[PDB]
């Protein structure tokens, strides 16, 4: 398409929402290609990532870790306004793995504090894709400080199985997983720093161990548990998008399955089926479709259970509905 042709396309104008929720959208595209407009502001801010008050100097798109999920359809244009407030201290940019050219957009979006930029790309490939900040020379430090999220480029006809039959979800959640590398003093106690730059040298040394101190969903241990558990009902169809911008993960729904899993995240690659535990390499997003069949609590984890239970990578679903004794029953309850 020419400049005039793109300028003539309909616009929309989307208000991004905080994960794990996803902004309103339609599974099947409404009409022809659009220029879909998104705005994000980068926040440099202290966050608490565990129950012991561990503080990190986050970088965070729209103030959240992960940044929000942007949803468009194949062959739409995604037009992002990115704002770096003058109160920030660092240059930031954005690399969309969905995009083609200029280091994912990183080369065209380097904004110092007090600057903004608008990037447009054609979403030519359907799938879920990571995005992250990527300032030359300080790439992993921004990413593992929280500056990453994902987008979903839906097929224009929505999702399908391997034989071309429709898969339509009732709800969608976006789980971003973050590996954090928090320095410790000689006594083994997590360190606090007055300014983010004070933390840099110490942080790189921990990063070089390739051993995170915390691996969390939605930015903190227990962020998707308790009152903040995800929810569903028996019979409900749920898409769970999962991303990890820097490090491998292996999602597992404890008590369920991934009925269909695009483990590569790419919708033209047929989904795996009946999955127990799927695998998403660092630098990618994946997505799993599941129909709940049993009510109760479910845990959704990185199935390195040390990472899940000791380091923070565990979420919950609370599911309403009627128990199915055919699928599972206690024939004899625990008894002496």
């Amino acid at each position: 398409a020419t400049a005039a042709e793109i300028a003539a396309l309909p616009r929309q104008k989307v208000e991004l929402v905080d994960p794990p929720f996803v902004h309103a959208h339609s599974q099947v595209a409404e009409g022809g290609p659009k220029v879909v407009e998104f705005t994000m502001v980068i926040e440099e801010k202290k966050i608490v990532i565990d129950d012991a008050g561990t503080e990190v100097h986050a970088m965070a798109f729209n103030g959240t870790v992960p940044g929000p999920l942007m949803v468009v359809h194949q062959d739409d244009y995604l037009e992002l306004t990115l704002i770096n407030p003058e109160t920030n201290t660092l240059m930031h940019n954005i690399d969309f793995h969905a995009a083609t050219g200029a280091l994912g957009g990183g080369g065209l979006t380097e904004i110092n504090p007090g600057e903004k930029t608008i990037l447009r790309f054609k979403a030519t490939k359907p799938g879920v894709f990571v995005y992250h900040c990527a300032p030359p020379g300080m790439v992993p430090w921004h990413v593992v400080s929280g500056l990453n999220g994902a987008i979903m480029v839906l097929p224009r006809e929505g999702l399908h199985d391997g034989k071309g039959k429709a898969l339509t979800y009732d709800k969608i959640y976006y789980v971003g997983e973050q590996d954090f590398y928090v320095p410790r003093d000689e006594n083994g106690k997590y360190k606090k720093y007055e300014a983010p730059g004070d933390a840099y040298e110490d942080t790189v040394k921990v990063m070089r161990t390739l051993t995170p101190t915390h691996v969390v969903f939605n930015g903190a241990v227990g962020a998707l548990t308790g009152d903040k558990a995800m929810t569903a009902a028996v019979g409900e169809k749920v898409l769970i998008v999962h991303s990890q911008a820097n490090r491998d993960t292996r999602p597992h729904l404890i008590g369920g399955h991934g009925d269909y899993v695009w483990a590569t995240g790419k919708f033209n690659t047929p989904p795996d089926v009946d999955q127990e535990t799927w695998f998403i390499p660092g630098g990618a997003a994946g997505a799993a479709f599941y129909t709940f069949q049993q009510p109760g609590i479910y845990a959704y984890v990185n199935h390195n259970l040390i990472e899940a239970c000791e380091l923070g990578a565990a979420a919950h679903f609370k599911v309403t509905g009627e128990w199915n004794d055919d699928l599972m029953t206690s024939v004899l309850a625990p008894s002496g």
Copy 2:
């Protein structure tokens, strides 16, 4: 099916055998759905895991690491009697990744020492699947102390390739891989503890390094080597089921291939073919089908060769038969 309908199905009544062997079964289902009955008892016991006499306080289904492979067919019911002897000190339960509901069955099977329980689930999905103990708050500690194994849910028509043609094995082996985290004193020597609870605090600290001290097959360095090597003949078709309940692995048959590999473990996901080294994420089982073409020794390894050769993850096959010079020949033997 209703309660009366399930109660009316034929029963069987399987005697589990120690890995890497697998209990008698039929590849193609014999008749309609059955309730297949299994019993396991959990043993808390000291085991030796290497050649230097390193001792671990195991937890072990039927006294082995891994626990035994249970084989049923799709849409059978698996009915497990699980017994926790009064001489044990800890509560245990079981999560079947093949099952749907109540945290894989974990929520319905919490048995203290001196208790038993019977769980029944419908095996709705064909594949190989991990099972493991999962007591709330001490999940990875039980799993990496040895309390895991796998099941196989065969399609009712047995295994097939990607074009629907039968794949029938002559023999099957189950290789369970276990990551152990053994504490060391200030001198670097592995520690022994009088009681398992004495080892807990020290063990968690090693687990949090995400760096195992030992990665072993069938519960010990060299457990599947020497007199205990697996065996085959040229022309024989072998299924090798492999599981890892907590950590990634990358199996490789040195001198062979995975002719067909269900790397996800799930039989409705078509197998990869002609594999050199396949990948199984922590929290999953996978399976590889191979027809031996050459006699001699083979090594079967986790192809992180540090894990294989330094940490224990190596097994052998001894294969009988006639050498094939077409496939491989020494044109000039090593010579000055």
Copy 3:
């Protein structure tokens, strides 16, 4: 085929070239099966792997890390002459993951300094495959000292997509990724050793951490950057073969995609498509096909960005041609 039948086949006689370049070959086979002849000599030599002058006692096929890519077609015979100079101090051999029998050929090729050997195998399976040295009892030490590479066994009809349509590349590159484990003194400074044997004990201890000090492409930090960047033009079709003999990797072309990716490396396993970041397990090769659509610099990385940016796993492409504003445009350049 019989001995006389193989002896009667046409020969060729290939001169191996240094990575990332690949020796001349034809995508579609020219005529019937051939015996394709390759010669490599193993060099034990000091190399510098980073910008700070870090020295390793390499072992290196034809003096390079990785060793060169050998290209044959399915059902050709690969006949390798392997030479271990008398100035070397260690026995070496070779395991071809493409081969069937005798530990990949390792059992038939053990050559002491001053010896040579000639091994022939039938390349029965199409794909890219790792090869590496594998001396009993010192396997990972030779591999992670640099003694590995890959081969490509092309289908006789060349490459195809999932629907059988031809995929013909304009150029091919071979990226070998190497994990190095370099000892440090108490002050944290990398150690130099007079003889390779002096480094052994210290090296094993670092290897057992499973934490590499360096993860590099083509044998050194920045080896495929600057003047040594790979190159392409807009519209050009490029195959990128990637191998890792010991450890997982997750390749990503920053600013592009893997249009078709044989992530398992095996051509009879249909390629994934539209990939952002693919995954190659340790002990395997994979291959990605991409048509460049935008000019400029691209980074090609292991997308654990700590491994990429801190440990060395990053390469560049410099791509000529006309910018495509449809695919991507800066609507508003960075501005206050």
